[PDB]
Structures are given as structure tokens and as C-alpha cells.
Design a protein around this ligand. Structure first.
Ligand SMILES: OC[C@H]1O[C@@](CO)(O[C@H]2O[C@H](CO)[C@@H](O)[C@H](O)[C@H]2O)[C@@H](O)[C@@H]1O
Ligand SMILES: OC[C@H]1O[C@@](CO)(O[C@H]2O[C@H](CO)[C@@H](O)[C@H](O)[C@H]2O)[C@@H](O)[C@@H]1O
Ligand SMILES: OC[C@H]1O[C@@](CO)(O[C@H]2O[C@H](CO)[C@@H](O)[C@H](O)[C@H]2O)[C@@H](O)[C@@H]1O
Ligand code: CA
Lengths: 698, 231, 224
């Protein structure tokens, strides 16, 4: 098996060895430098695709160093199209035990060879047999394999007694009280408290601190632990020792958005669950539903991330869809564990709707729509030490201590917290105004909650749900009616028939915005648009957002002019993000525009594949959907770091990983084959027979 | 004959390619047309045999050029030059061998369009190999014979093979290399490779899984050559 | 001239034309002077490449023969493979006899340095071993015995004249333990010799020494 997991793949003369003395000391440098030129003829292409050729790598480290010496000219431990080497390397054949060789040609197969050798070295191998099929692998098959079989595992976390201290460790706050790792525990979780204490005493070098949270978690308290930050406890289950039966606790698993993260995040987790279900890693997706229930129960809300300085802040809500898709994958009504899970998730969803999203201060009483408007006092402590200094002329201590009050600062920081909770940190759609906007984003997602909560009440609560908090009774018809109210309020305040956009509506000054955003497509995803509204959005909104690589986060017109005073922001034109693609693909599908999704997915899939092929298998946080050569280069705000790896990239990025697997589901065989051969959209579309042009809405 | 085939498959496994040539040679001499598998066995045999001399010729040529730039180097150069001369002799003999099998047996008896394109392309290949190193009139006879063989292959490939066929794409790739490297015509080379790449896009779905993988790698070489030729 | 023959041997290695590399170095070794260490490596590399590709073809041909033996009603393919293998065995015999005869007539007798003594006898033990890999009957017995004697004689000089970190001595122990494991089928002596030569090397003081010790530990692991 040439495509087994590297753990397997790298875990007579093929065994017993004698001295290798096949090369004289004069051979490499006796005549100076003598590099062969790559041949561009067809040559051995037929043997490469059909021969089942295998290599003998006698010395993994020697071959690695040769390949980097010849092919990595910028010395970044990567073989990319910007390297200026000869693009050919001889490797010994397996059947001749290295005494004869063939040529590996081209940036892509040489980069794969670099990767395979680097990975073999990581497993301690210093001599290997290597299938050519593992280095001439079709790039679409290769990235899918790596996402499904290697990236999710590396993105997976699971708290146990031996890693709590490391997972809790945090570096964003440089106070004395943040030197040690710390874990905060809900006041009514004493089994979990004792577990983390036990974890501390077993690893005393970490100096892990364990603290009970108060019975009631206020904005005042969260500010009070700015200098003593901690990880937050998540859901756990009981585990037993095989020999003794001693009980310990082990956390449900979860996925992080990127390898440098140890925290469970908010809206990433739903997009990741979608990719995880495709990879049959259902336990990880279910684990995060468990944690989101735990957070809602014990912290009042789904958290941006599970640390204390986030206790007042949420993120865009997807719990009812997340619960539904996991429920189905687990077997639906036929599985009583899945039925119980769905009930606990929808109970938690109903609490979240009522006491976070449609409660003050997020609820706009006049319009009834909601704003990203979190509570919380003072200056956010987790940012860089000087991040807010340009907005500080008089001090920090006296402002947080409430000694000196300043309502223009309070509005500044309120918008800052709201920008983070919106997920879109940062964009000129939200700078200085976010907490006053009733976005199409959030209220589309609440429409989804209402429709989904209505179906759940009808089918699992005998059409009569009783709030455990206020003991009210609600029916599916009541929730369908709240959705209808919402659907008509959104159209009233947000729908712009002339542009075909839904615009965020500002609730303080009581006027609609004109910022053109890709989140307009969330009205399709959530199902609230009408046929006529969807049709004008496809006709007039989509041409303003559909770029080479997919949907820009906003139009170039709305973002406005960029200068030194007004730098680029990462959730604006020309950048494209995986959540905007995924929600838009399914939204358009819902309304009969699958043919449009196909085109948009081909654009996004080509852009990710091109970067994968040409740049050493990289996967990146977000893309430039207008950039043709290196769309993975994004220098906005803090820029992409997915390029900082040596030899082989290890994880990618959660929802970007998921977006590639999900997008491929739309591609038929002709389109998969054209992506595999690196055919740009302009050439793929223009090659279609006029009948097949219709499959991509052209 | 069925024996000679089996013994060619064995020699390939042993990577003893001059024996692979012998077995495939007597098979191509007997009157019967070759299957797909048999003509690929013949091509792999001869290409591996000439390929070793081509690589040797090129590394010895570079050594020779390096040496003739040194002062007072006439003695080393004539050793190098005479060693290169022995490699050129085998190059022409291997080429003439396959070229005679093509001219007298395989090109006359070819009845399908595939086989006809396959063999005219091989013929263009080996005249091209002769043009790479031959002096004076022999270079010109090989240069012209190579063009004429690729031309004939292209005419037949245009009417008998779909634009995505591995054999057609491979023909355009090798023909484009001839234009660039032998005739020194970067405009003809660039456009031929570009037209061939593009024309293969529309019908990628009609190919078997194994043919799609052959055409993918061929198109990779077309792309990468285009990158080089547009500096 | 002798200098031209060395130059043409280096040029033939660049061309990976090893049969020709053998001809040039065979004439250098058969005429007069003792070989320098560089000329001794050129000779050794020339034959190891010529014999090495033949040995690899031989192992794959034999592996295929073994599969086709256990197929039903296959006598005709089995005759074909066996006949093909015999052609390779003939080449193996001609090549090994060629270098052995050069070792016996010229290289071993003219060896003054003790290091080149261990080199040439280890080489003789190697090529008798390659014969014993495929030979049968009394020709196998004769190759085994002459291989053991060359290795034993090489070990005595190296044990008393080369540091246990020297590559030529470590290399000798590696190949000699292989002779024990593969030819004489004495896994105990293979293990013991390999262990001891690793130990007496790890018991004291270059990349080339550590590579061979690596191969000694690898075989040792496998054999256990
Ligand atoms: O007042 C209940 C309210 O408080 C929160 C967060 O502060 O949860 C706290 O109270 C719960 C009920 O006693 C405890 O289970 C929980 O551990 C504690 O943090 C919210 O989750 C809840 O809505
Ligand atoms: O990479 C984490 C870091 O990025 C920020 C802002 O740059 O948030 C972005 O990354 C998150 C991926 O987990 C997204 O959830 C969020 O929507 C996105 O803007 C920071 O907020 C975060 O600390
Ligand atoms: O129209 C596509 C799709 O949208 C749904 C809801 O998902 O209904 C929407 O469209 C109708 C307008 O044409 C409205 O009547 C309805 O209110 C609106 O939600 C589905 O019914 C339909 O499949
Ligand atoms: Ca590089």
C-alpha cells in the first residue's frame, strides 16, 4: 500500500546489509560541478504512471541534503516554483538496489519527495524503499488524503491528567499572575476541580493553579481576573484503569482551528464538524457539541475561546445546525444516545437564544433585531501590550479601576469587543460601529435557530416545550411565527431591492448601511430570503463579490481607499475566507442555484490546489481571491503563518481544511480531473461544450 | 515469440535493457502487429538503452568543455574527446537499429491510427537523438528526417486520435521540444505546446483512469516547459 | 600510460560506464607500482558496480522464479527464468574470477601497508562470498572456505594493526558477520562478531565510522 498512514508506511538485502562502497571519493567534486539538465520530453511518463516503480533510498539524510542543496535556492526548507534549481534529481531504483537510477522531474514531485524524506526522517528511518505513487500522487487526491487522515488528528485535542498543564499554558498576557498555567472550574463541578488538582500534584513543575469560579460570573469579576488568566474547564467523561479500576476523568475530544492553538473556538467548530463528519471522525464533532452544551450551562454562552478573558464574549451561533448534522451522522432517531444528545443541545440552544442573543444588551428593543454587543468592562487584557496605545492620551490602571470614567473610550472598547464576537476581526464594515449594527450575519443565524427550534419542539417535545428557567410553554407554531416576524423585519430594515444586497442596519442612528458584504448570502443559508430576493442577489450582488478564487469578504467599493492611515484589514476585499464560501455554497444550493455553487467551488478549489501544488503543499488561514500566482500570500494585519514549516506542512487550518473537502463534494469527474491537472477557471469554463456550460451557471 | 515477450518482461524486471531490446527486436521483426503492451515494451527497451548513452554523452561533453578552457590541456582533451567519440558511435548504432525496424517492419505494417502515430513519433524521437550530437551533413539529414516524421505523426494524430489522448499529447510535447531544442524555433515550440495543452482540457472525462494519469503527467511537462520558454 | 588509464577510469565513473572503468583500473593494478588509496578506491568501486547490478538482477530473477514455481502447470516459464538466471550466474562468475585473479597475482602480494592488507583480503573474502551466494556443490564449498580464510586473515591483521574505529576494520566485521549469517548460516558467530566489533568500537574513540556502526547495530537488531 503506497498511500497508507505515514505511521504505518515508515514504521534479503531489503533487510541484511553489507558495506556500501559504490561511489569513489572523486565522483562528486573531482570534475567540478556537473548538474544534469532536466529533459522536457515525454521520456518515461508511461512508466511513471503505470509501471509501479519503486525507489531505494540508501541514505535518507544524504539524499535530503542533496535535494535541498540543488533545489532549495532560497533556503526556506521548501521546494516551490520560486526556487531556481534544475528541477531534476536521480534516485536509485528498488530492483537494482540503488545501482541504477531514474529521474524525478519538476517542482511538484520533487517537493513531494522532500516531504516523504522529511517524514521518514521524523520516524527515525535512515534508509527506505519508496513508491513513486506516493510522490507523483494527483494533488487533489493528496490534499484530500492528508486533510482526512493526518490534519484532523493533528488538530485534535483531548484533556487528560498528563496534558492539562500544557494545554492551559498561555502567553498572551505578561503579568506576574500569568506566569503559571491556571484552570478555572465552574463552582458546581467538584469532580472536575479534584481532577485538575490531582493533575497539578502529579506535575508539580508546571505550578498549575486550580480555582473555583464564583456562583455568578459578572463583567466585574471577569475584569478582576485580568491579571490571573486561566483556561476554562470543558466537558469530561469517566475513564477507568484496566488493572485496578481507578476512576479518572478524560475530556471529550475537540478540534482547534490551527496547530498553534489549544483552545476550543466558537464558529470554527461547526465548519470543522462538517469536515470531521466527512472524515468519519464523528467523535471529535460530537465532542464539540458536548463542550458547547457545557459552556452554555456553566458560562452562559458559547465562548469565543475557552479562556477566562473571553467569559463575556461569544461568536456567531451555529449550535442547532451543528447538533442536527451530528445527530444524523450518529444514526438519528434510531440511536438513543443521539436522541438524548440532540435534546440536550437544543435545550442549550434555546437557553442561548433567550438569554444571550435575544436578551439585553444584544437585543435592540426598538427593532427587535440583535447586535454583537457583549458586556465587559475596561481594556481587553489579552492583546499586545501596546495595541491600544495610539488610542490613549491622558493611566491604564486608573481607567480599568473605574477611577477615571470616559464614555468615548467605553464606546471604543465596546465596538472592539463586538468586532471580535462577530468573528470578522477586523473589517471596515465594523470598525467603530459594530456594536450598533443589526447585521444580516447574526439575524440570519437567529432565523436558523428559530426554524430549527420549532422543528425540534414539534418532533421531540410533543409540540409543547416548557422553559426550565421561566416555565413558559411554547409550540412549533409560536417559533415559526417568531421566524416569520424576523424574516419580515430583516427585509424591512436591510433588504435593498436595487443592489440585491441585505445591508446591516445601524440601530443607534436608525439607518441602513451600504457596505456590500459576502454575508449577504447567509440569508440564503438560513432560508429567510424569498425566491425573488435570492434571484436579485445572484443577478446583482454576486457579480460584485465573485473574484478569480471565489467570494471576496466584501466589495472593493465598500472597503474604500487604502493608505498608511487606513491599512488593509483581513475580513475585507481582496481576501476570501472559508466560512463565507461554505455558507454561500449551501445557501445557493437551497434556492436552486447549485449550478452557481459549482462554479464558485471550482474557483475556490482551483486556488487552494494551485497553492498546494506550486508551494510545497501549503494550506493557509485565508486566501487572496484576486491573486493569480501566490494567492496564499496574505500580509493583512498579522498575515498568514501557514507557510512557516520545514519540509512538510502538518495541519492546515480547520475550516479551510473543511472547505476543500466540502467543495469537492460538488465537483463531478470532469471537474475533479481538471482541478487535478491544474486547469484555471478561465480555461476550464471556456473548454466546456455549450451544453455543459450550463452546469456552472454560464 | 510469446517466449520473447515473456523474456522481455523479465529483463525489464532485472533492469537489463539491452536484453530487453533483443527480445523485443525479434518480436517486432516477425510479421504480426504489436499490441498496445508490446509496442510500449519495445519503446521502453530502446529508450532505456539509448538513454544511458545520452546521459553519458552529456556528462562527458560538459567535462570536455570545462577541460578545453584550461591552458595547456591538449592531452586531457584528446582523451576526453576520444572517449566521447566511442559513446557517439553506440548512439548512432542504437538509433539506426530502431530506425531500421521502424522503416522496414513497423511503419509499413501499422494498420490502426494509434500504432501509426506511435511509430512516426518514435521515428521523430530517434532522428532527434541523432541530431543532438551529429556533425555536419548527418545533423542536417537527421534534423530534416525528424521534422518530417513528427509532421506525418501530427497529420494522422489530428484525424484519428481525440485531443486528450496520451499518444497525441506526448507527440506534441516531443514535437515542441524538437522545435525548441533542435530547430531553435521558440515561437513554433511555445504555440504547439500551448495549443496541445488547451485542446486536452475539454475531454478529460472521456479517458480511462489510467489514461488520465498518463495525460496528467504529460500536461505537467507541457506546463513546466511553457514556464521555461516564457523565461 | 598509467596516468591516462587512471584518468579514463575517473571519466568512466562520471559516465557510469563501469565495465570500461574496470578495464582501465584492471590494467593499472596489473602493472608495477602499488596502488594509492585513491587508485585502490577507483578499482574497488569499478568492480562493486559491475558485480552489484548483476547481483541485484540475480535476486529479483530468483524471487520471480520462486513465485512461478508454485503456480500450477508452469514448467515452461520455470525453464525460461532458470535459463535466464544461469546467464547472470555466468557473468557473476566471470567478474568475480576476474577480480580474484587480480587480487591473487598482484594486489595481495604487493601490499606493504597493513591497512591495504586488510582491504585486499576483505575484498577477496567479499568476492568469494558473492560466488558462494549462488554456487552449488563443491564450487560452493570452495568459495565458502576461501571466503572464510580471507576474512579470518583480514581480521587478524586488522585486530593487531587498525583501531576498532577504522572504517576498513568495521567494514570487514560487517561483511564477515554477513558471511556468517548468510553463507555459513551460523547466526551465533554473526551476532558475536558484529556485537564485539561494535562494542570494541563504542568502547573507544568520522561519518564513515559511524555509518558502518549503524549498519552493525541494524543487522544485529534484525537478527535478534
Ligand atoms: O445564574 C445562572 C447563570 O449563571 C451561569 C454563568 O454565570 O452559570 C452559573 O450558574 C449555574 C447555575 O447555578 C451553574 O451551573 C454554573 O456552573 C455557574 O457558572 C450561566 O450558565 C447561567 O445562565
Ligand atoms: O488565529 C487566531 C486569532 O485570529 C483572530 C484575529 O486575527 O481571529 C481569527 O481567527 C479565528 C480562527 O480561529 C476566527 O475564529 C476568527 O473569526 C478570525 O477572525 C483572533 O481573534 C484570534 O485570536
Ligand atoms: O425558495 C427556495 C427555498 O426557500 C424556502 C425556505 O428555505 O422558502 C423560502 O422561499 C419562499 C419564497 O419563494 C418563501 O415563501 C419562504 O417564506 C422562504 O422562506 C423553501 O420553501 C424553498 O425550498
Ligand atoms: Ca525554497
Amino acid at each position: 500500500d503506497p498511500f497508507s498512514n505515514a505511521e504505518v508506511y515508515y514504521g534479503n538485502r531489503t533487510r541484511t546489509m553489507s558495506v556500501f562502497d559504490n561511489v569513489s571519493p572523486f565522483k562528486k567534486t573531482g570534475f567540478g560541478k556537473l548538474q544534469q539538465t532536466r529533459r522536457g520530453s515525454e521520456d518515461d511518463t508511461y512508466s511513471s504512471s503505470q509501471g509501479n516503480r519503486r525507489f531505494f533510498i540508501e541514505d535518507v539524510d544524504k539524499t535530503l541534503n542533496e535535494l535541498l542543496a540543488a533545489e532549495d535556492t532560497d533556503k526556506n526548507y521548501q521546494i516551490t516554483i520560486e526556487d531556481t534549481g534544475p528541477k531534476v534529481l536521480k534516485v536509485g531504483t528498488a530492483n537494482s538496489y540503488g545501482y541504477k537510477h531514474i529521474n524525478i522531474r519538476g517542482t511538484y514531485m520533487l517537493s513531494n519527495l522532500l516531504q516523504e524524506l522529511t517524514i521518514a526522517k521524523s520516524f527515525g528511518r535512515h534508509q527506505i524503499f519508496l513508491d513513486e505513487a506516493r510522490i507523483n500522487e494527483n494533488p487533489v487526491n493528496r490534499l484530500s488524503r492528508l486533510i482526512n487522515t493526518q490534519f484532523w488528528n493533528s488538530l485534535t485535542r483531548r484533556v487528560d491528567l498528563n496534558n492539562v498543564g500544557e494545554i492551559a499554558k498561555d502567553t498572551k498576557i505578561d503579568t506576574p499572575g500569568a506566569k503559571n498555567p491556571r484552570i478555572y472550574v465552574p463552582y458546581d463541578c467538584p469532580e472536575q476541580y479534584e481532577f485538575y488538582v490531582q493533575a497539578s500534584q502529579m506535575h508539580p513543575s508546571l505550578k498549575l493553579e486550580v480555582e473555583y469560579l464564583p456562583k455568578k460570573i459578572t463583567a466585574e469579576y471577569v475584569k478582576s481576573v485580568n491579571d490571573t488568566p486561566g483556561l476554562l474547564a470543558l466537558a469530561m467523561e469517566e475513564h477507568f484503569n484496566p488493572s485496578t479500576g481507578e476512576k479518572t476523568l478524560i475530556g471529550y475530544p475537540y478540534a482547534v482551528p490551527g496547530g498553534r492553538f489549544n483552545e476550543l473556538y466558537g464558529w470554527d467548530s461547526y465548519m470543522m464538524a462538517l469536515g470531521l463528519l466527512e472524515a468519519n471522525k464523528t467523535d471529535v464533532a460530537r465532542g464539540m457539541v458536548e463542550h458547547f452544551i457545557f459552556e452554555i450551562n456553566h458560562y452562559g454562552k458559547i465562548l469565543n475561546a475557552n479562556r477566562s478573558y473571553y467569559l463575556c464574549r461569544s461568536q456567531p451561533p451555529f449550535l442547532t445546525e451543528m447538533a442536527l448534522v451530528v445527530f444524523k451522522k450518529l444514526g438519528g432517531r434510531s440511536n438513543p444516545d443521539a436522541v438524548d444528545l440532540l435534546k440536550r443541545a437544543f435545550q442549550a440552544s434555546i437557553k442561548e437564544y433567550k438569554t444571550v442573543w435575544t436578551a439585553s444588551p444584544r437585543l435592540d428593543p426598538e427593532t427587535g433585531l440583535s447586535r454583537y454587543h457583549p458586556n465587559g468592562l475596561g481594556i481587553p487584557p489579552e492583546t499586545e501590550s501596546d495595541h491600544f496605545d495610539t488610542v490613549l492620551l491622558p493611566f491604564k490602571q486608573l481607567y480599568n479601576d473605574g477611577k477615571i470614567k470616559e464614555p468615548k473610550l467605553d464606546e471604543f472598547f465596546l465596538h472592539d469587543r463586538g468586532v471580535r464576537e462577530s468573528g470578522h476581526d477586523t473589517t471596515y464594515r465594523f470598525e467603530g460601529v459594530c456594536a450598533y449594527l443589526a447585521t444580516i450575519d447574526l439575524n440570519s443565524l437567529l432565523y436558523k435557530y428559530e426554524i430549527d427550534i420549532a422543528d425540534f419542539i414539534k418532533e421531540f417535545c410533543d409540540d409543547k416545550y416548557e422553559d426550565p428557567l421561566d416555565h413558559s410553554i411554547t409550540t412549533s407554531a409560536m417559533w415559526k411565527e417568531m421566524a416569520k416576524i424576523r424574516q419580515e423585519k430583516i427585509t424591512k430594515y436591510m433588504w435593498d431591492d436595487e443592489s440585491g444586497f441585505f445591508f446591516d442596519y445601524n440601530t443607534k442612528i436608525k439607518h441602513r448601511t451600504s457596505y456590500e458584504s459576502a454575508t449577504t448570502f447567509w440569508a440564503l443559508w438560513a432560508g429567510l430570503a424569498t425566491k425573488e430576493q435570492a434571484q436579485k442577489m445572484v443577478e446583482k450582488a454576486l457579480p460584485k463579490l465573485e473574484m478569480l478564487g471565489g467570494l471576496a469578504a466584501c466589495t472593493e467599493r465598500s472597503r474604500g481607499p487604502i493608505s498608511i492611515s487606513r491599512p488593509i484589514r483581513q475580513w475585507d476585499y481582496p481576501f476570501g475566507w472559508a466560512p463565507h464560501q461554505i455558507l454561500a455554497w449551501e445557501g445557493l444550493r437551497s434556492y436552486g442555484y447549485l449550478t452557481v455553487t459549482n462554479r464558485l467551488a471550482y474557483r475556490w478549489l482551483f486556488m487552494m490546489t494551485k497553492a498546494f501544488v506550486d508551494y510545497n503543499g501549503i494550506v493557509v488561514e485565508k486566501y487572496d481571491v484576486t491573486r493569480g500566482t501566490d494567492p496564499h500570500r496574505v500580509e493583512a494585519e498579522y498575515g498568514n503563518q501557514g507557510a512557516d514549516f520545514k519540509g512538510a506542512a502538518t495541519e492546515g487550518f480547520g475550516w479551510v481544511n473543511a472547505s476543500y473537502i466540502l467543495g469537492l463534494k460538488y465537483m463531478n469527474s470532469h471537474a475533479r480531473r481538471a482541478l487535478g491537472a491544474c486547469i484555471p477557471p478561465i480555461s476550464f469554463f471556456s473548454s466546456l461544450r455549450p451544453q455543459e456550460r450550463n452546469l456552472y451557471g454560464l | 515469440r510469446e517466449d520473447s515477450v515473456y523474456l522481455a518482461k523479465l529483463a525489464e524486471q532485472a533492469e537489463r535493457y539491452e536484453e530487453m531490446v533483443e527480445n523485443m527486436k525479434t518480436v517486432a521483426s516477425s510479421g504480426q502487429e504489436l499490441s498496445v503492451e508490446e509496442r510500449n515494451l519495445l519503446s521502453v527497451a530502446y529508450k532505456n538503452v539509448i538513454g544511458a548513452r545520452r546521459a553519458s554523452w552529456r556528462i562527458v561533453s560538459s567535462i570536455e568543455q570545462k577541460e578545453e578552457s584550461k591552458e595547456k590541456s591538449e592531452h586531457q582533451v584528446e582523451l576526453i574527446c576520444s572517449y566521447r567519440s566511442k559513446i557517439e558511435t553506440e548512439l548512432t548504432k542504437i538509433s539506426d537499429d530502431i530506425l531500421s525496424v521502424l522503416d522496414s517492419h513497423l511503419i509499413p505494417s501499422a494498420t490502426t491510427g494509434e500504432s501509426k502515430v506511435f511509430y512516426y513519433k518514435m521515428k521523430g524521437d530517434y532522428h532527434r537523438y541523432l541530431a543532438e550530437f551529429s556533425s555536419g551533413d548527418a545533423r542536417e539529414k537527421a534534423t530534416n528526417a525528424s521534422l518530417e516524421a513528427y509532421k506525418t505523426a501530427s497529420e494522422i494524430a489530428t484525424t484519428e486520435l481525440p485531443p486528450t489522448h496520451p499518444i497525441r499529447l506526448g507527440l506534441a510535447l516531443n514535437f515542441s521540444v524538437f522545435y525548441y531544442e533542435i530547430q531553435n524555433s521558440p515561437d513554433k515550440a511555445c504555440h504547439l505546446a500551448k495549443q496541445a495543452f488547451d485542446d486536452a482540457i475539454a475531454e478529460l472525462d472521456t479517458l480511462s483512469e489510467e489514461s488520465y494519469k498518463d495525460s496528467t503527467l504529460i500536461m505537467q511537462l507541457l506546463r513546466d516547459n511553457l514556464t521555461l520558454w516564457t523565461s
